[PDB]
């Protein structure tokens, strides 16, 4: 496969299931590179466990924690990490009111040359445990010798886009590996960036960020087919935010039309949402306790009930994975038949106007609250018109998408509910025979 992109591995799945899924502790082996240093971008961290996943040989090197913690949270990880002289920390400027760092990457210095990794998991046992989860693994892209003058950009600009996002930081901790950046040659880079940065951008830089990002990729590097109209969009998320009183609000108006876009030229298109039930919660691998990183609030649900009439259930039997709830977040663009994917984006921003962003100033300003960072497979990166979907993830014909859930997507039904976190569920048992009492 080209497309390197990986679900982790899950605890509980027969091994078939397994095989080609990674754990944390095979991406950063010395099979992958011998590591000088390495960045953690994340929103949460257990530092004990996370220096465990290194290699031993490997655990004393310069480790930075991205993060956007405050106030005692700020405290309680510095503590976490004052064990260990070489963890530095990076706090990224939050300075949009309920915005976080939601970013999930390892930047992956070796003796050898350099490693991106962009996915979805916390660092954090849990999230790597039952959980479904996504992953883009860069190739091993190698140093540009001294002396030598060349762009090491790729046709899809990953390398200056990566380090556009970057920059937004303004940090001097990430100036150090924008320089790294610089030295290494990305030009092998197929997929295209897709990062959100906190901000109110205007003008010049309405299209670098968010779901003006994708509509600008979508615009210039996809084009229309015939019947457009009838191909639906597939959101995926584990988070929903509040998203207005009705769908014109936000989500069928502005983000559903970033969504649609295809090609240059100027809706009854399709919108399905995926995001677990109350059943999908119970019966899954974790039971209730999944809906831990589930976090939707009935404060926020009773608002929007319009919303859940778009909602379709878990299933993900081309993985193995329908026990293993979702953490991915995942947006594509399936034919009428999903036999084809116009394109396919694995990232970090749920269902929310904090990640993906939301127009103000009469549509002149995309303010966008918080840090998220996905990786977008587009057809035309590949030499191809559409990819098609692959009937079984792990099956082996293969400019096929590994798609890691079942199209077409089930509707809930009439008795099913979406898992609102802070209700309790007593009136049926989980996997492992407990209730859920917030
Ligand atoms: O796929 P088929 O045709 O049905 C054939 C088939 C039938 C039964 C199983 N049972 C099974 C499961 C399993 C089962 C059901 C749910 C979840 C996990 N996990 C394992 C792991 C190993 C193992 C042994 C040594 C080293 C490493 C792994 C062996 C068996 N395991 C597996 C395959």
Same mark, same amino acid.
């Given at each position: 496969?080209?497309?390197?992109?990986?679900?982790?591995?899950?605890?509980?799945?027969?091994?078939?299931?397994?095989?080609?899924?990674?754990?944390?502790?095979?991406?950063?082996?010395?099979?992958?590179?011998?590591?000088?240093?390495?960045?953690?971008?994340?929103?949460?961290?257990?530092?004990?466990?996370?220096?465990?996943?290194?290699?031993?040989?490997?655990?004393?090197?310069?480790?930075?924690?991205?993060?956007?913690?405050?106030?005692?949270?700020?405290?309680?990880?510095?503590?976490?990490?004052?064990?260990?002289?070489? &963890?530095? $920390?990076?706090?990224?400027?939050?300075? *949009? %009111?309920? +915005? =976080? /760092?939601?970013?999930?990457?390892?930047?992956?210095?070796?003796?050898?040359?350099?490693?991106?990794?962009?996915?979805?998991?916390?660092?954090?046992?849990?999230?790597?445990?039952?959980?479904?989860?996504? &992953?883009? $693994?860069?190739?091993?892209?190698?140093? *540009? %010798?001294? +002396? =030598? /003058?060349?762009?090491?950009?790729?046709?899809?600009?990953?390398?200056?886009?990566?380090?556009?996002?970057?920059?937004?930081?303004?940090?001097?901790?990430?100036?150090?590996?924008?320089?790294?950046?610089?030295?290494?040659?990305?030009?092998?880079?197929?997929?295209?960036?897709? +990062?959100?940065?906190?901000?109110?951008?205007?003008?010049?830089?309405?299209?670098?960020?968010?779901?003006?990002?994708?509509?600008?990729?979508?615009?210039?590097?996809?084009?229309?087919?015939?019947?457009?109209?009838?191909?639906?969009?597939?959101?995926?998320?584990?988070?929903?935010?509040?998203?207005?009183?009705?769908?014109?609000?936000?989500?069928?108006?502005?983000?559903?039309?970033?969504?649609?876009?295809?090609?240059?030229?100027?809706?009854?298109?399709?919108?399905?949402?995926?995001?677990?039930?109350?059943?999908?919660?119970?019966?899954?691998?974790?039971?209730?306790?999944?809906?831990?990183?589930?976090?939707?609030?009935?404060?926020?649900?009773?608002?929007?009930?319009?919303?859940?009439?778009?909602?379709?259930?878990?299933?993900?039997?081309?993985?193995?994975?329908?026990?293993?709830?979702?953490?991915?977040?995942?947006?594509?663009?399936?034919?009428?038949?999903?036999?084809?994917?116009?394109?396919?984006?694995?990232?970090?921003?749920?269902?929310?106007?904090?990640?993906?962003?939301?127009?103000?100033?009469?549509?002149?300003?995309?303010?966008?609250?918080?840090?998220?960072?996905?990786?977008?497979?587009?057809?035309?990166?590949?030499?191809?018109?559409?990819?098609?979907?692959?009937?079984?993830?792990?099956?082996?014909?293969?400019?096929?998408?590994?798609?890691?859930?079942?199209?077409?997507?089930?509707?809930?039904?009439?008795?099913?509910?979406?898992?609102?976190?802070?209700?309790?569920?007593?009136?049926?048992?989980?996997?492992?025979?407990?209730?859920?009492?917030?």
């Amino acid at each position: 496969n080209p497309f390197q992109f990986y679900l982790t591995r899950v605890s509980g799945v027969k091994p078939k299931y397994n095989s080609g899924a990674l754990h944390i502790k095979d991406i950063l082996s010395p099979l992958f590179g011998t590591l000088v240093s390495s960045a953690q971008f994340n929103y949460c961290f257990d530092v004990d466990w996370l220096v465990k996943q290194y290699p031993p040989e490997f655990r004393k090197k310069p480790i930075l924690l991205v993060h956007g913690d405050k106030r005692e949270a700020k405290a309680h990880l510095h503590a976490q990490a004052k064990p260990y002289e070489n &963890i530095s $920390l990076c706090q990224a400027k939050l300075d *949009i %009111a309920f +915005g =976080t /760092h939601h970013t999930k990457m390892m930047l992956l210095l070796y003796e050898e040359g350099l490693r991106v990794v962009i996915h979805t998991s916390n660092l954090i046992h849990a999230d790597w445990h039952q959980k479904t989860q996504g &992953i883009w $693994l860069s190739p091993l892209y190698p140093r *540009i %010798a001294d +002396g =030598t /003058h060349k762009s090491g950009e790729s046709p899809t600009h990953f390398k200056a886009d990566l380090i556009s996002y970057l920059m937004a930081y303004n940090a001097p901790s990430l100036k150090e590996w924008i320089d790294v950046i610089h030295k290494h040659d990305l030009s092998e880079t197929n997929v295209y960036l897709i +990062g959100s940065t906190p901000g109110r951008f205007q003008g010049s830089q309405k299209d670098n960020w968010g779901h003006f990002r994708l509509k600008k990729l979508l615009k210039d590097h996809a084009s229309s087919m015939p019947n457009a109209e009838s191909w639906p969009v597939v959101g995926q998320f584990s988070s929903v935010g509040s998203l207005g009183a009705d769908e014109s609000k936000w989500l069928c108006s502005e983000f559903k039309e970033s969504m649609l876009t295809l090609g240059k030229e100027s809706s009854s298109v399709p919108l399905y949402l995926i995001y677990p039930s109350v059943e999908n919660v119970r019966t899954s691998l974790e039971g209730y306790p999944a809906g831990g990183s589930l976090p939707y609030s009935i404060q926020t649900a009773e608002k929007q009930n319009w919303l859940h009439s778009y909602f379709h259930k878990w299933s993900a039997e081309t993985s193995g994975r329908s026990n293993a709830m979702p953490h991915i977040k995942t947006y594509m663009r399936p034919s009428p038949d999903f036999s084809k994917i116009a394109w396919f984006l694995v990232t970090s921003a749920n269902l929310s106007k904090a990640a993906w962003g939301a127009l103000e100033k009469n549509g002149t300003q995309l303010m966008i609250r918080s840090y998220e960072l996905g990786v977008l497979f587009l057809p035309s990166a590949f030499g191809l018109d559409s990819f098609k979907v692959k009937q079984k993830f792990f099956a082996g014909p293969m400019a096929t998408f590994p798609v890691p859930y079942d199209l077409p997507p089930e509707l809930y039904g009439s008795k099913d509910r979406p898992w609102i976190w802070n209700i309790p569920y007593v009136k049926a048992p989980d996997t492992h025979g407990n209730m859920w009492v917030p």
